[PDB]
């Protein structure tokens, strides 16, 4: 049988010795030629249905030879096209002949999912009647026939007649519903065994028909067989067994077997019995009937196996990221933008830490990359872990080189030479190559070379020139399929791609939301937690400045918390001030006012709502823009916020899509929002909390949410330090971690405890919530962290003075984490 | 040549005598069999590419026979499928054999434009190299190849040699880029003339290659030719002549011809010259290269003609109503809904008039329809005129029957027997059948029978049972294609479908607009003329009642005009009152107020806006709905309307989409809206008229716009009376005509004069805009007709006291007409 060779970064199938050349193949016996051709097509079909590979055959001659007319025609039938170069390319070195097979269908959601079949097969074993002949359906015809089946006569008069005279002339000829089969007495029982699978499936697949046994094809005469040889009882059961043996695949309820009518009649010659004749009426079948199992092959594990009949049908008719597939062009342009003229190392943060940690790594990488003048080099601490494989101790880093005029190469750097070094790099290159095809949906020709380098001071195949990345279009298309592959795993670039999907999802909701600037002057935006309410507020001011043609300092941003005010002031898009400064300082020069987290405002310091209305109403261009952003789920106090009653909060805009948190984070928010609705606060208006998110909305970005309880303060602090070190070891930046506590009075106590456990991790410096641009871990209270967002958030002991607000601190906490969240509740 | 015979309601091609039956067809010589097969395939290809038809052949035998294996295989290659029944079905009666060919591609915008090719061809004459063999591209392969082309070596060393030793062995074998050809000296000149056509386009279509003449294929030995026969100088001329004769179709600029390198080298034997060898290098071609003209046929006029190379490429690579195709399912249910259990006559208005004028027509039609128990019978005064054909005097009516278990039949009822009557019905049935396929996009098997009935007291071809409408699915799918056919012409059913498309376009814009009820309480809707501003006002009040669960009388509708108030009050959806009644009566029990055409209000009676706010704000559910609908393009006075300044008119919804007027009417409005912007009224605010329609919005509904000037007052009336009579003759109801004059004081003058000329047309009854339910022609002033709409509108002598308002009456008048408008301006 055919087995896959495991010492290569591809699917290599060795078929043994194959005679090549039409002159050499003609001299062979038909049986041997058929066996060799069948083995070659088995390998080719397996590689077409398994994502591509190489077919290795050893030829009996030294000089170059052609593959052969029969093999070429069989491959053409396999791919149903004369474009034989687009899938198969041949090379030969010495006594070995190679055929490099491309993948037929690439990706789980191909662009031609509803057009071309998923499987290539030698024969589908689906016969249907075509006028006076029985023909087999190829892959496209079988696909169309199964699609059709998936959705929800003069011959009768002879059939009812009970006896037939010898030599009777049948008026009707052979046609779509009538077949005349000559019945021979020498192999009469063998003849019945073989003719049933050929014609019964043909009629049942197309409207049914009649099958006459014992009637000459040309002369249409009734002859039958010898009455001595034929046993009508023994003959009847064999036909019944043969018809019931045919495999049938049902797409409907019920699933009754094949319905047919068998009639055995006496043949009379000169008024004397001469023999028996067989009439078969096959009723049309509600589904497909197979003459035998389909001849389609696929590679599972290290073996080549044939697909079962029910498994073949399922593939013909029928973590994956939906968001990554549609945004793959913009995601690639952000992270993996190919640079013209020089070779770029990504990530730059991880590359810098690698060269400083290991001496000589910078010079080793540069010496190997001299021949390459353009491309991108993607670094990682272990590319096997990024592909859910096992890490090999002693590997410094893995690099995937995607350069022009060169096939992709996966470099593995070892700090000392190891016997398993080449085996580890080969398995990761082979795994990455298969994912780029079967998961990233790459429709081109791709091969990943496995190269091993050592820091301290089997042969690869020579792929055809069409496997090399010729220009920008091929490298860009290959990188876009790597984005889909990366988004399905957990790694450094999986999260950096996951972060950019959230920014693309938020920009989609903003475009719908940004249309309200021309229609409204005073607007009350009721956003939901994690819906990007703060992000739109920043985006509108960029649009307000352009639309109204006012300078930046005319727009005023008012918030409740000091740390968020600093964030807005850093971007220089407006003047950002706290509520207290808004009431105290005079703002007669302000034209437009944007208010954020209005539910957290307080009225004891003054009447902020009236003053904001007065300033905007008295603008030069009539009424100015006064957009009030608020979310009643994140109310931080039980006092009166000074807002008008819910009836007067019009016109109103609603943000219901959660577009700033990962999938497990979003599910946590929606589950927690249900608890808030069941126990509304007394100060909160009754009808405001009746807001529901989108019925079926998924961010398509995977994250992490772990709850660890019954841990002491010392025990919690080590877990935070260990998790941060694990993230920083993989290459994350320290500016992606935020630690949030219940109250601002406990910030100083937890800060000393955090440094005590984190001093062992080579970082002893933290930043406050007031400084977000610093490359330090932010440790501050949840309430003072409102309006900000971080990639990794650790919540330590969520607590508040009033148990009524206790359900509200969690939702104000989980909404601050974009991808990773770790909560350590009270014991 | 093959010519279609014009005596049937289909494309019938007579191919003459054809031998049928495999036993009979085996006995013929290859030449005669090939000629017969090629004739049959020409007919089949013509009918496949021409919309379907019948192939008539006269067989030489009486008993039923099969068509033959070779013909079946040729048809299978023609349709590229073994499903030979879905396109060809055979019938035989006596000495004639019929093949009923279905259309390959139906409609100008099929569902498979990018999936299946448009043309069926015997051969595309496109050859491409397939490994070591040259293969011709089928229709699908040629389609894919042209789609790809439309988007914007050891053999070299031997080529550089200047002489070749006799018997030299070429190291390389024949491959994708190398071809070895033996050169025969007996017919050496004629050999070259035919070798170039099939091999040079093969290389040029796929990356190019090398062509060697004079080398043995099997042994790779260089032989050349004899010196006495081959002349190197003259041999070059024909080779470059033959390569330049290949037709080439370019998709790009520039269009340089095929580029190749020719070298003729001496063949030396034992150091002595023996002959010449020809080496050809073919550079890859930027576009497709044809060995000869494609073998595709089509029926044009009364002949069967072959498509030229330039035309064949265009069809394979590349009035029609786009809106009709989208809404064909909804349009069918409104008009042509098949009734289960009885036969329905449409239109009912035309059916009633037909039986009244002509005695015995009801008895004749009912007698003919007895066998049919289900379906729809579509009546018309002349179906030929509906299809842009010529009217035949003496025809009472034409009826198209679409019934269950019966092919469509077009009945032509004649007052008296006429010899031409059968020709008239056959030509209309043939035209209607082709429109249903080539224009309506019907992908099934359709035949339209032509039957002639006479009120006063060639054989019909028997189509197969697959042409009969078996059930509701086939009848429904056939009528949806008739909807698209009708919408492309000008007729009664074309206009009734045009009115329903406008009602579906308005319902599309309402769904977008209806989302503002949840977000707004006070709203200022700035609509454009013809945008359906009044229609949304009625639809909103039905949504307000459902959403707020209030009783119907709780909603108040306020309008300036009395005729508009009457129309709204008749629908029993709210309380409709005039502005004057609003200020006079007390409405303390009203919760929601909807104001329409607010730009026509006046302050001479009091503050209507102030009273509106007080009633709505004091509602039980806080602030009630107060939506103000206005259109500044249709202001009927220069006084103050009482609306707040343009700066205080917020929030806003803008209806910019013209969805209530046909295409000619809509283009007239936008042209006139430009004049209004070029000179706004002084009372009109500065920035309100800056509302623009969509950049590219088309209704896709045909209409009529005719402007006749310099006619006297008497001449206007007879034109209106004649136009009304011709419309009523076709079956248009009188309630579709409105006559609009400039001022209400001239209404009585024009009413008397219109009746003077219209009395000759058997209609004397006129009505005012206060009553629109009556089946009468409405005649009032333009300003009095605000808010209402009619299908046919006649504008007579537009005029106003102030020339500033002069452009305002035309835009207000034109917006009243939905499909037909006739303007008679002052001379
Ligand atoms: Zn079934
Ligand atoms: Zn070109």
Numbering used by the authors:
A (entry chain A), B (entry chain B): 7 to 158, 188 to 353, 381 to 519, 530 to 899
From the paper:
Schlafen 11 (SLFN11) is an interferon-inducible antiviral restriction factor with tRNA endoribonuclease and DNA binding functions. It is recruited to stalled replication forks in response to replication stress and inhibits replication of certain viruses such as the human immunodeficiency virus 1 (HIV-1) by modulating the tRNA pool. SLFN11 consists of an N-terminal endonuclease domain (residues 1–353), termed Slfn core domain, followed by a linker domain (residues 354–576) and a C-terminal domain with homology to superfamily I (SF I) DNA/RNA helicases (residues 577–901). SLFN11 forms a homodimer with the helicase domains adopting an autoinhibited conformation.
We recorded datasets of SLFN11wt and SLFN11E209A and 2D classifications yielded classes of monomeric as well as C2 symmetric dimeric SLFN11. Furthermore, monomeric and dimeric SLFN11E209A were reconstructed from two different datasets, resulting in maps with global resolutions of 4.0 Å and 3.25 Å, respectively. In the apoenzyme structure additional density for a metal ion appears at the proposed nuclease active site which is coordinated by residues E209 and E214. Density for a metal ion could not be observed in the cryo-EM map of mutant SLFN11E209A. Mutation of the ion coordinating residues (E209A, E214A) abolished the nuclease activity completely. The active site residues E209, E214 and K216 are essential for catalysis.
